[PDB]
Amino acid sequence: MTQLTREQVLELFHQRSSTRYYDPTKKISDEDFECILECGRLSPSSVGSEPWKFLVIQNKTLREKMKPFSWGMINQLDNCSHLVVILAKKNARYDSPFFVDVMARKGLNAEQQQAALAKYKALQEEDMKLLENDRTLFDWCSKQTYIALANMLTGASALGIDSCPIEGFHYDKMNECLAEEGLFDPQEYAVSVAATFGYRSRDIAKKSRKTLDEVVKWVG
Amino acid sequence: MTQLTREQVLELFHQRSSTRYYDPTKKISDEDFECILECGRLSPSSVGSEPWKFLVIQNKTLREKMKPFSWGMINQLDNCSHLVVILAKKNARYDSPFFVDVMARKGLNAEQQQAALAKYKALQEEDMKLLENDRTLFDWCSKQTYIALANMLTGASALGIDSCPIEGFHYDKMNECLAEEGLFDPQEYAVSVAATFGYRSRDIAKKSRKTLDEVVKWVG
Ligand SMILES: Cc1cc2nc3c(=O)[nH]c(=O)nc-3n(C[C@H](O)[C@H](O)[C@H](O)COP(=O)(O)O)c2cc1C
Ligand SMILES: Cc1cc2nc3c(=O)[nH]c(=O)nc-3n(C[C@H](O)[C@H](O)[C@H](O)COP(=O)(O)O)c2cc1C
């Protein structure tokens, strides 16, 4: 098993910073980048839903086409080693074909599936109130994809690989772009969040966070 | 700098599983659990919004009060060492006082603030269409808190401490419950997600995930 001291764990999450300036001469090995993607694939997700898809956008022409509506990463698109656009599943209702696969991956038998479907329905409809509209239910999947996002960042960091998480683009324009390019079915998926990966070309900014006393309330 | 091999990074995310059964005779040390909290505090977040608050629910009475509407952690409420209920910030509009503190942590002068506010309005109103209603704006904050959740699960795993993310509870009753105890302002925050921590009483269940070829689309 992988074990670290508190000092090592602190440094790992302290050393990961948002890299906005990448060295264009350095690329991540195929072995290293596969490892990053694995951090995403292995991430936990609510009821094992795994509602993500990781588009890896290495095509230079597609990257260029995104610049005019991707201000959050416009200078990173040229220089980063790798770009992942994470999609989230649309309409992941408890009764959709999508949850049939969720349960098959669990090896549920028919009676367990009936209980699981009741669980999912309760969670979605009553506990979490996700079935109000398409957007709330999509955002539930999206939340899960940010878990994958976070583990990919941390995993990149552990490998000595710099990253930047990315929201700064027009989402309608991004969805239209990528869907028009044939990269996903827009009725089935939509863009959730993005992230660049590479090796920094400039200095990383000092961490700036709220204090621990500001963000924690102990209820003893 | 903390550095891991590819194999160690994989094992970090294979060894972490959702712990349903905690040994009640085993407690996380105060130092270890502060380290876990630091993983969440140091997490990245969109425009550095850090829109989380971490409620550490150690009180036994209060844990017991939560049991009847928290089916997703019924046995865990009793046996786990530590419980965190993560809140996300409500109504985190670009022009809110919440964002006055966001810019202040970034040391922005007056000119930098008017540019940042213009960037925040663009992101919320046009790019991400977060201002449709209160819930879409909340769910944006909630997505950031799932990064902090992920990093606390991962940091715990590197310390050798087991965890389980928790959505399985009635959100309306839990909001009502924690607010009634006077633990947060329901008009400023709402419950996002929860997580248990401690030491597992059973061996790790093998991962079941979609394959890498199923979740990755390479666009060369
Ligand atoms: C956001 C979220 C909420 C979850 N809620 C619960 C819960 O309430 N009860 C539970 O036992 N597991 C919960 N889990 C754990 C998942 O069921 C689990 O991650 C999935 O089945 C994969 O198993 P693994 O994490 O052990 O690989 C949740 C996971 C996530 C990411
Ligand atoms: C979901 C999300 C989206 C982000 N989008 C952007 C982006 O579009 N452009 C950018 O340069 N930074 C982006 N960031 C990075 C944050 O601005 C950054 O994490 C924070 O301001 C500074 O902290 P750090 O360097 O400690 O990560 C984003 C971060 C997250 C979590």
Author numbering:
A (entry chain A), B (entry chain B): 1 to 220
Tell me what the authors wrote about this structure, in their words.
Phylogenetically diverse bacteria can carry out chloramphenicol reduction, but only a single enzyme has been described that efficiently catalyzes this reaction, the NfsB nitroreductase from Haemophilus influenzae strain KW20. We found that expression of H. influenzae and Neisseria spp. nfsB genes, but not Pasteurella multocida nfsB, allows Escherichia coli to resist chloramphenicol by nitroreduction. Mass spectrometric analysis confirmed that purified H. influenzae and N. meningitides NfsB enzymes reduce chloramphenicol to amino-chloramphenicol, while kinetics analyses supported the hypothesis that chloramphenicol reduction is a secondary activity. Previous kinetic studies of nitroreductase catalysis revealed that reactions progress by a double-displacement (ping-pong) mechanism that appears to lack the gating steps necessary to impose specificity, explaining the substrate promiscuity of these enzymes.
To understand better how variation in the substrate-binding site mediates activity, we solved the crystal structures of the NfsB homologs from Hi KW20, Hi Int1, Hi 86-028NP, and Nm Z2491. The Hi Int1 and Hi 86-028NP enzymes showed comparable, although statistically significant, kinetics (q < 0.05) to Hi KW20 NfsB. The relative increase in resistance conferred by H. influenzae or Neisseria nfsB expression ranged from approximately a 16-fold increase (Hi KW20 and Hi 86-028NP) down to an ∼2-fold increase (Hi Int1 and Hi 12). The divergence in chloramphenicol resistance and in vitro activity likely reflect the vagaries of heterologous expression in Es. coli and suggest the presence of important subtleties that still need to be accounted for when estimating mobilization risks of cryptic and proto-resistance genes. This is especially evident with the NfsB enzymes from Hi KW20 and Hi Int1. A molecular explanation for this difference remains to be determined. Intuitively, the Ser68-Met74 pair found in Hi 12 NfsB would provide more of the flexibility needed to properly locate and orient Trp71 to make space for the ribose of NADP than the Pro68-Ile74 pair in other H. influenzae NfsB homologs (Pro68-Ala74 in Nm Z2491 NfsB).
